[PDB]
Amino acid sequence: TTALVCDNGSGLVKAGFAGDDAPRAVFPSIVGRPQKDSYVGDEAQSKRGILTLKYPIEHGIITNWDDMEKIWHHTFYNELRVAPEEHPTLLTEAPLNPKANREKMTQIMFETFNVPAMYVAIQAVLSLYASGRTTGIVLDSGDGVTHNVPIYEGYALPHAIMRLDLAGRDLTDYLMKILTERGYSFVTTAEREIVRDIKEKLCYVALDFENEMATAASSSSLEKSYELPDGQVITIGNERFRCPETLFQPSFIGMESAGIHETTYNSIMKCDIDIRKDLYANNVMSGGTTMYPGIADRMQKEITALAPSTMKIKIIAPPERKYSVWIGGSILASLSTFQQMWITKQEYDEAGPSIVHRKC
Ligand SMILES: COc1ccc([C@H]2OC[C@H](C)[C@@H]([C@@H](C)[C@@H](OC)[C@@H](C)/C=C/C(=O)[C@H](C)[C@@H](C/C=C/N(C)C=O)OC)O2)cc1
Ligand SMILES: Nc1ncnc2c1ncn2[C@@H]1O[C@H](COP(=O)(O)OP(=O)(O)O)[C@@H](O)[C@H]1O
Ligand SMILES: [Ca+2]
């Protein structure tokens, strides 16, 4: 029977059937409760006023299992409209996901949803498979968290994994702030959803930050107009490139951590010397926050400036990197040499949660 692929994202839940072109269902990772006892996804925030909203998978890691259970329950019956007892289910997890976490991910799958078989894959790793690589370093920047994950011979290197608590969610908020400072007023939650659309449609990464700031202070060639739903037309200037700039300079929002370019460098320099030249030549971009135009040219420039001059440096930004993680799981599930890595109902009834250390 057709396997299931569910990418448990920090902001969006990508779910669908293994072997498909794209995930059939994409919805918010939010659980709302004060007509019913709970809501999940779009309608959870449509009625955000009467409910209490929950981000159980924010920052990449699942923290609440009652809410998560509601998200998975929403995925199976309401979105994909399948019987979880009739489908092997591949789950995804954030890098550096603790052991007891994937144990509990597995327990809930069998004891509560009764899956025939399941598996938990690291998100960044799947994105690499989707590119056609078993070796390389992935920059996974989603909604709630950004990870740098070096992968060698098809296996991620935990000690060199970098975690940056800065992603598109922080950027959206940042874009509201600086747009409000200019003279507008985007404060409400409904206005947040509007600003996020501006971010995805008009923002871009500046090749050189200061030079772009100068073109903005002296001309209006960088300015773009944006029509609000109520017909009102607003104008965005340097906020276009100042927004994603936070990924390289987290200090703009008080975050005293290294940028995505530096965390990439630091990640590689934690790996064994012999494979570093391979990581440099295979920098894969993953997640929606890496969708900014010009982010690859900026990454190319900054990594080069940090690395030896003799170093060959390549940046890979796939056009479908919004759904890289899910696609990677779709091919993994359909892979013949992977079938023996499933954890079956029988296997779990015999061993317990202790078996996920043997397969995952
Ligand atoms: C969607 O477009 C495409 C994407 C990729 C490819 C294809 O390109 C050539 C690649 C050698 C190939 C590889 C990378 C993929 O196979 C389809 C990928 C699924 C293979 C992964 C593995 O072999 C690993 C090492 C093993 C074990 C898994 C370890 N794990 C999950 C650790 O976390 O899985 C059987 O993938 C072809 C088309
Ligand atoms: N074209 C785009 N430009 C910039 N950001 C985008 C674009 N498309 C989506 N995003 C951002 O990507 C984030 C979604 O990332 P995602 O891959 O779902 O990560 P996660 O699975 O952790 O939520 C959202 O915060 C969204 O604002
Ligand atoms: Ca993700």
* CATH number, domain with residue 249: 3.90.640.10
Task: Find the ligand nearest to 341 CA.
Answer: 1
Task: Find the ligand nearest to 130 CA.
Answer: 1
Is 330 found in the same domain as 208? no
Which residue's CA is the closest to the ligand 1 atom numbered 32? 155
Is 336 found in the same domain as 198? no
Task: Find the ligand nearest to 121 CA.
Answer: 1
* Ligand 2 within 6 A of CB of 168: yes
Query: What is the side-by-side order of every strand in the sheet holding 39-40?
Result: 39-40, 31-33, 52-54
Kindly state the tokens that stand for 54: 């929950």
Choose among 83, 6, 90, 13: nearest CA to 333.
90
* Residue 116 CA, ligand 2 centroid: distance in Å: 32
Residue found under tokens 């009625």: 47
Query: What is the resolution in angstroms?
Result: 2.9
Which residue's CA is the closest to the ligand 2 atom numbered 21? 9
Which residue's CA is the closest to the ligand 2 atom numbered 19? 142
Helix, coil or strand: residue 244: helix
One-letter amino acid identity for 169?
R
* Ligand 2 within 6 A of CB of 292: yes
Last residue within a domain, chosen from 257, 281, 299: 257
Choose among 320, 291, 268, 313: nearest CA to 151.
268
Is 340 found in the same domain as 307? no
One-letter amino acid identity for 130?
A
* Ligand 2 within 6 A of CB of 12: yes
Quick count: other Cβ atoms within 10 Å of Cβ 218? 8
Q: Which of 335, 339, 343 to mutate to test the pocket of ligand 1 (most atoms within 8 A of CB)?
A: 335
Is 278 found in the same domain as 161? yes
Q: Are 264 and 148 in contact (CB under 8 A)?
A: yes
Which residue's CA is the closest to the ligand 2 atom numbered 7? 200
Please state how this structure was obtained: X-ray
Choose among 269, 298, 10, 26: nearest CA to 148.
269
Choose among 30, 102, 115: nearest CA to 333.
115
Q: What would you report as the CA-atom Rg of the chain, rounded to the nearest whole angstrom?
A: 21
Count of the separate structural domains present in the chain: 3
* Ligand 2 within 6 A of CB of 9: yes
Is 206 found in the same domain as 340? no
* Ligand 2 within 6 A of CB of 199: yes
Last residue within a domain, chosen from 214, 242, 257: 257
Half-sphere exposure of 129 (CA within 13 A, CB side): 21
Residues within a 6 A CB radius of ligand 1: 121-122, 125, 129-130, 132-134, 154-155, 327, 331-332, 335, 337-338
Is 115 found in the same domain as 2? yes
Kindly state the tokens that stand for 169: 């969610």
CATH number at residue 317: 3.30.420.40
Distance CA(53)–CA(205), nearest Å, equals 32
Distance of CA 352 to the CA centre of its chain: 30
Torsion over CA: 218, 219, 220, 223 (sign): negative
* Ligand 2 within 6 A of CB of 30: no
Measured in Å, how far apart are the chain's first and last C-alpha atoms?
22
Kindly state the tokens that stand for 99: 């052991």
Distance CA(321)–CA(336), nearest Å, equals 24
Q: Are 280 and 268 in contact (CB under 8 A)?
A: yes
Q: Are 165 and 258 in contact (CB under 8 A)?
A: no
Q: Which of 134, 140, 330 to mutate to test the pocket of ligand 1 (most atoms within 8 A of CB)?
A: 134
Task: Domain of residue 283: give its range.
Answer: 124-165+258-324
Is 152 found in the same domain as 33? no
Is 192 found in the same domain as 155? no
* Residue 275 CA, ligand 3 centroid: distance in Å: 25
Strand runs labelled E in the chain: 4-8, 12-17, 25-28, 31-33, 39-40, 52-54, 89-93, 117-122, 136-141, 146-152, 155-156, 162-164, 224-227, 233-236, 283-286, 315-316, 343-344
* Ligand 2 within 6 A of CB of 8: no
Kindly state the tokens that stand for 55: 């981000």
With 0-12 / 13-18 / 19 or more C-beta atoms within 10 angstroms meaning exposed / middle / buried, residue 332 is buried
* Ligand 2 within 6 A of CB of 143: yes
* Phi, psi dihedrals of residue 7, rounded to the nearest 5°: -90, 105
* 15 contacts: CB under 8 Å, gap ≥ 6: 4, 5, 6, 7, 23, 24, 25, 26, 75, 79, 80, 326
Distance CA(325)–CA(9), nearest Å, equals 9
Which residue's CA is the closest to the ligand 1 atom numbered 7? 132
Is 252 found in the same domain as 170? yes
Is 267 found in the same domain as 250? no
Is 130 found in the same domain as 119? no
Which residue's CA is the closest to the ligand 2 atom numbered 12? 288
Distance CA(19)–CA(319), nearest Å, equals 19
* Residue 164 CA, ligand 2 centroid: distance in Å: 15
Is 80 found in the same domain as 1? yes
* Residue 130 CA, ligand 1 centroid: distance in Å: 7
* Ligand 2 within 6 A of CB of 142: yes
Distance CA(51)–CA(33), nearest Å, equals 4
Q: Are 114 and 345 in contact (CB under 8 A)?
A: yes
Distance CA(317)–CA(66), nearest Å, equals 36
* Ligand 2 within 6 A of CB of 261: no
Torsion on CA atoms 342, 99, 61, 338, rounded to nearest 10: -20
Distance CA(315)–CA(331), nearest Å, equals 23
Last residue within a domain, chosen from 257, 288, 305: 257
